[PDB]
Design a protein around this ligand. Structure first.
Ligand SMILES: NC(=O)C1=CN([C@@H]2O[C@H](COP(=O)(O)OP(=O)(O)OC[C@H]3O[C@@H](n4cnc5c(N)ncnc54)[C@H](OP(=O)(O)O)[C@@H]3O)[C@@H](O)[C@H]2O)C=CC1
Ligand SMILES: CCCCCCCCCCCCCC(=O)SCCNC(=O)CCNC(=O)[C@@H](O)C(C)(C)COP(=O)(O)O
Ligand SMILES: [Zn+2]
Lengths: 208, 114, 134, 297, 86, 126, 95
């Protein structure tokens, strides 16, 4: 399997597994799962009451020093009752490593804002509000950041359509750009591309 | 059924926040009609505020009306500070849209929508 | 003439030969000014001043449940008892058999392809009939 | 009814209204808002234009792709009128001038060109023709405008007997020459009574006359809700505008009172709420700014 | 003016429909002999409560609950229907 | 405490920003999608889908393209179970109807049945 | 091989022409309906049937990797030629 297969990094896999054990036993109040991927990335899956303790630990601990918030992300998964998956990508410059911190909420439970831990998060979780509707409690200036000013709904939710609900045009009668319900001259043609045959037997979910 | 609140522990605090948000909009409407130089009257914009508040008058969950007050404060903040333009404020008044058929028979005449 | 929807053009309850109620779904919309059928009858009742107490399809199906509640229980065969009582009612008026033999109307594959208005309008069924006759 | 002209959609920009309109005189004040309100339904609008194509640019954002067809035309050319009307199912006539020029006088603008358009639309099988007269059009009028426009009304009726003739009184809007005339005149007060009508009311009425089959052969009188005296109307215009090119025919028409014809239908027989001047006068006259409302009769 | 059709709904297995089932097992045959041109639509279903629909002239439909009745109460309600024509 | 007691049905229709036309007049269909009979693979029949009623698709006057006015005409969701799908439809105020999952019944396969002594299940060829 | 409707409008190789009463002819008024006059069904009919002596021939449209995928055409039917599914060139077994 030499030329075309990605070579596995066993050293970093073992190191990130040991550090995941370390984080799981220092913070067992909040840590739910710890998993290391096959391409050597460490995910810490936490309870959302420990956003500030887990991130402050990873920022300030002498064996962590994850001083850099790379990215902050929600993922909408509608089949879960806590459908929003808040992902924290942290970067350690001292130990040259990355860690993923993941937690959950639904549409109504707020997540505690992490601008006291990372000032990078100020626009990121504001974008998560704008795109998903995840309210972040005790945020300095939480409002929209990317959508238009009168915009209704949260576009990156998966029950939100691709073209939205309203579209704009200029109207010469009222001398004003107006919002009218969306009508496409050509509908977005949905392609059912999924193959009816299983591709990855290692990822097979067990039957009921 | 034990959920973490947003701002209001129950519906009375929630209605307090709805009431203060309505007070803030009612004070703001003359300023909005003036500085955006809208072609509406102050009574007409206040009727639109009352329409938007009576639209959500069925909600019995404190967290949902906490989020409704939060989004109403965000709309208010975009309207007091001139972040919206005149077009965003007039998008509440669906003026270029044709009046939709209401009863069964006119909806039958124009098309297939129920 | 009142242009109606076809079975691919309306969500619509059909019951098969065994009592299983089933609903179609709207694949496409009817062509031109053609409308759904109960919409036409309900609009006719509103014009005539004898308005039918339903507006949406769900209310038509509430009426349909009021007339027999197994028309809204979809993909369900409801069993029917009381063969004995129908047999006792069938012995009342003694009807006589005609001497004509039992001949079904569809004897060969020729008579299969065109039975209703959609099959008779089909050029593919016309090719089928022409191909099975030659 | 042909299959491509059956209406579809929810009545929006990409929908199909089934209205294929040729609007003569579409580059003007009324044609602007008529092509606006047609193209937002999804109508195939045909714009014969006399002018520079730069002056028809504002009509292109008014409908979906391929829904406004521009073409050259001449008022004395029946070939261009035929080339414009032979595919339409409604022809709206909006050709007019406040002033007569070297080539086109009031008779050519109001009599020759309207009767030519109506006759060519008649022989091209166009079902509907909608002609715009003036409310004060009279054979015995003192202005040459209203005499030629009454004669043209007569000829359009007797060459297209199913046409919908419409009598606007004095249309006010942003691009009018009624309130913008008074805001710039900075003529005198007389015994004149007027009831001006808003341009969106006139446009909604023309479209409701397109759609209603009961408007064929009728004559409508589009008037506002409130009759005003001329003098306090002009003082209300100067009061809204925060203020302390003419000819004698325009003076003859300003000092000609709006006749009341209750035997003719109006905007309410087309289902249009007449908008009063007090709501839209600020919208017209906000541009002229560097108020007790007007007294009705 | 007069009665047009009678609809009887019932479950096949519920104890609330026991009186309706015991009505249809015994008295329906002489009911239909007594009413030769009256449609009496017995419509069994899976979980319904028993019900006596009676349609009169001009689309007027009265609705009678037959839940937990005996066969005698079903006979009395149905003969009230046949005697009313209201 | 810092946990309140909400005894109400979870309804977020005011928060999703969807217009009332596309909330109260739409019918969700909750179903396991049927196997494409062009193929023997069954991997597309594992998850619950939510689609909506198909509204009008008309012809573009210019190009002949398929114009639409339905925003939810391409919206297909994916659920692990039926109950997650029903909870999502009730949470968003969508009227729904649910088809139960259709599994193929177990078959009794015998290659020896093709060559029987006294049964009709002999194959005439192979 | 373009032909013309009685309205004067050209007909494409699909067979598309607008009707006499269809309003959408107004888009060509003062302009032109652009058709291509090289009809492919007429041009491939002008190519002669290739006489070959094998029972199975192959075709890739000429040019190697510049043509189409290489397909193998049976020629057992003596009544009908064997036609390529991609390029439309047709073949006949000479015996
Ligand atoms: N307040 C009002 O304006 C009222 C108007 N009316 C009538 O309504 C109609 C439309 O009014 P309105 O829009 O305001 O007037 P405009 O002068 O603004 O528009 C007239 C239109 O006709 C065209 N036109 C004018 N003269 C000629 C000509 N000789 N040959 C070809 N085209 C010509 C103009 O195009 P181009 O730019 O190419 O010249 C323009 O598109 C007129 O008939 C008018 O009499 C009635 C009552 C009140
Ligand atoms: C220019 C136009 C400006 C438009 C402004 C739009 C802003 C819209 C803000 C909307 C904010 C809300 O919807 S919060 C309202 C939701 N409240 C509830 O569901 C609780 C029920 N509320 C009520 O019944 C309210 O009437 C009261 C006043 C709290 C009590 O009334 P009841 O007693 O009888
Ligand atoms: Zn080839």
């Amino acid at each position: 399997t030499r030329p075309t297969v990605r070579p596995r990094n066993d050293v970093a896999h073992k190191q990130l597994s040991a550090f995941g054990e370390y984080v799981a036993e220092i913070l067992p109040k909040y840590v739910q799962q710890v998993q290391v991927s096959c391409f050597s990335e460490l995910e810490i899956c936490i309870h959302p009451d420990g956003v500030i303790p887990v991130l402050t630990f990873l920022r300030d601990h002498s064996n962590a020093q994850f001083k850099s918030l790379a990215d902050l992300t929600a993922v909408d998964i509608p089949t879960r009752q806590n459908r929003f998956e808040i992902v924290y990508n942290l970067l350690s410059l001292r130990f040259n490593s990355r860690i993923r911190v993941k937690t959950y909420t639904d549409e109504l439970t707020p997540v505690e804002s992490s601008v006291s831990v990372y000032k990078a998060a100020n626009w990121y979780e504001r974008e998560i509000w704008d795109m998903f509707g995840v309210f972040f409690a005790n945020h300095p200036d939480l409002r929209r950041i990317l959508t238009d000013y009168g915009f209704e709904g949260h576009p990156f939710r998966k029950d939100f359509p691709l073209s939205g609900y309203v579209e704009l045009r200029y109207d010469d009668e009222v001398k004003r750009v107006v919002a009218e319900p969306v009508e496409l001259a050509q509908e977005f043609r949905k392609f059912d591309l999924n193959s009816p045959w299983e591709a990855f037997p290692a990822y097979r979910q067990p039957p009921e | 059924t034990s959920v973490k609140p947003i701002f209001s522990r129950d519906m009375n605090e929630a209605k307090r926040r709805v009431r203060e948000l309505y007070r803030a909009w009612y004070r703001e409407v003359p300023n909005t009609v003036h500085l955006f130089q809208l072609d509406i009257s102050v009574k007409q914009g206040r009727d639109k505020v009352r329409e938007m508040f009576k639209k959500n008058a069925h909600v019995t969950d404190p967290r949902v009306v906490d989020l409704l007050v939060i989004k109403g404060k965000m709309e208010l903040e975009e309207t007091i500070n001139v972040w919206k333009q005149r077009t965003h404020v007039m998008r509440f008044f669906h003026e270029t849209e044709a009046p939709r058929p209401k009863d069964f028979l006119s909806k039958f005449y124009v098309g297939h929508d129920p | 003439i009142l242009p109606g929807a076809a079975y691919t053009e309306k969500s619509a309850t059909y019951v098969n030969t065994e009592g299983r109620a089933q609903q179609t779904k709207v694949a496409v919309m009817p062509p031109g000014l053609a409308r759904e059928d109960w919409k036409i009858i309900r609009a006719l009742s509103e014009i005539a001043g004898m308005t039918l107490p339903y507006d949406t399809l769900d209310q038509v199906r509430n009426r349909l449940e009021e007339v027999s509640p197994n028309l809204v229980r979809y993909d369900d065969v409801e069993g029917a008892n009381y063969f004995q009582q129908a047999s006792e009612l069938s012995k009342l008026v003694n009807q006589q058999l005609l001497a004509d033999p039992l001949v079904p109307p569809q004897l060969t594959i020729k008579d299969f392809y065109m039975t209703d208005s959609i099959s008779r309008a089909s050029q593919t069924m016309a090719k089928c009939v022409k191909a099975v006759t030659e | 009814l042909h299959h491509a002209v059956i209406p579809h959609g929810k009545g929006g920009r990409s929908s199909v209204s089934g209205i294929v309109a040729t609007v003569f005189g579409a580059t003007g004040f009324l044609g602007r808002y008529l092509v606006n309100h047609l193209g937002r339904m999804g109508s195939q609008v045909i714009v014969p234009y006399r002018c520079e194509p730069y002056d028809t640019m504002h009509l292109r954002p008014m409908g979906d792709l391929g829904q406004i067809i521009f073409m050259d035309w001449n008022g004395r050319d029946k070939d261009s009128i035929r080339r414009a009307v032979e595919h339409s199912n409604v022809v709206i006539n909006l050709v007019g001038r406040e002033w007569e020029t070297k080539n086109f006088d009031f008779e050519d603008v109001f009599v020759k060109i309207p009767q030519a358009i109506a006759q060519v639309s008649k022989e091209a099988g166009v079902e509907k023709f909608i002609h715009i007269s003036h409310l004060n059009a009279d054979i015995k009028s003192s202005s040459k405008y209203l005499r030629n426009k009454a004669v043209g009304e007569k000829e359009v009726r007797e060459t297209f007997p199913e046409a919908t003739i419409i009598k606007p009184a004095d249309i006010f809007g942003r691009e009018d020459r009624f309130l913008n005339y008074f805001a710039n005149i900075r003529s005198l007060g007389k015994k004149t009574v007027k009831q001006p009508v808003y341009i969106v009311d006139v446009t909604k009425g023309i479209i409701n006359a397109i759609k209603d089959p009961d408007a064929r052969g009728k004559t409508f009188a589009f008037v506002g809700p409130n009759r005003y005296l001329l003098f306090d109307l002009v003082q209300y215009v100067f009061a809204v505008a925060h203020r302390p090119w003419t000819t004698r025919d325009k003076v003859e028409r300003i000092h000609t009172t709006d006749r009341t014809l209750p035997h003719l239908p109006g905007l309410e027989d087309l289902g249009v709420q007449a908008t009063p001047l007090e709501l839209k006068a600020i919208e017209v006259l906000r541009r002229h700014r560097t108020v007790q409302p007007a007294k009705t009769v | 003016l007069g009665l047009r059709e009678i609809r009887i709904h019932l479950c096949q297995r519920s104890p609330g429909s026991q009186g309706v089932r015991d009505f249809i097992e015994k008295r329906y045959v002489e009911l239909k002999k007594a009413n030769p041109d009256l449609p009496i639509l017995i419509r069994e279903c899976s979980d319904v409560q028993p019900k006596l629909w009676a349609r009169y002239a001009f689309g007027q439909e009265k609705n009678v609950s037959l839940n937990n009745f005996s066969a005698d109460q079903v006979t009395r309600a149905l003969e009230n229907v046949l005697s009313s024509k209201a | 405490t810092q946990l309140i007691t909400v005894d109400e049905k979870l309804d977020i229709t005011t928060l999703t920003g969807v217009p009332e036309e596309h909330i109260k007049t739409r019918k969700a269909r909750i179903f396991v999608p049927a196997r494409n009979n062009m193929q023997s693979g069954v991997n597309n029949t594992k998850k619950w889908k939510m689609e909506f009623d198909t509204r009008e698709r008309w012809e573009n006057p210019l190009m002949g393209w398929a114009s639409t006015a339905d925003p939810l005409s391409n919206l297909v969701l994916t659920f692990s179970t039926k109950e997650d799908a029903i909870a999502f439809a009730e949470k968003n105020g969508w009227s729904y109807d649910v088809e139960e999952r259709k599994v193929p019944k177990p078959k009794s396969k015998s290659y020896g049945a093709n060559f029987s002594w006294n049964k009709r299940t002999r194959v005439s060829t192979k | 091989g373009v032909r013309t409707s009685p309205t004067g409008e050209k007909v494409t190789h699909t067979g598309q022409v607008y009707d006499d009463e269809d309003y959408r002819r107004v888009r060509f008024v003062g302009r032109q309906k652009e058709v291509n006059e090289n009809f492919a069904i007429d041009l491939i009919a002008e190519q002669p049937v290739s006489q070959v002596g094998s029972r199975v021939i192959s075709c890739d449209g000429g040019g190697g990797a510049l043509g189409h995928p290489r397909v193998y055409i049976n020629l057992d039917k003596e009544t009908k030629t064997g036609t390529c599914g991609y390029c439309g060139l047709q073949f006949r077994q000479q015996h």
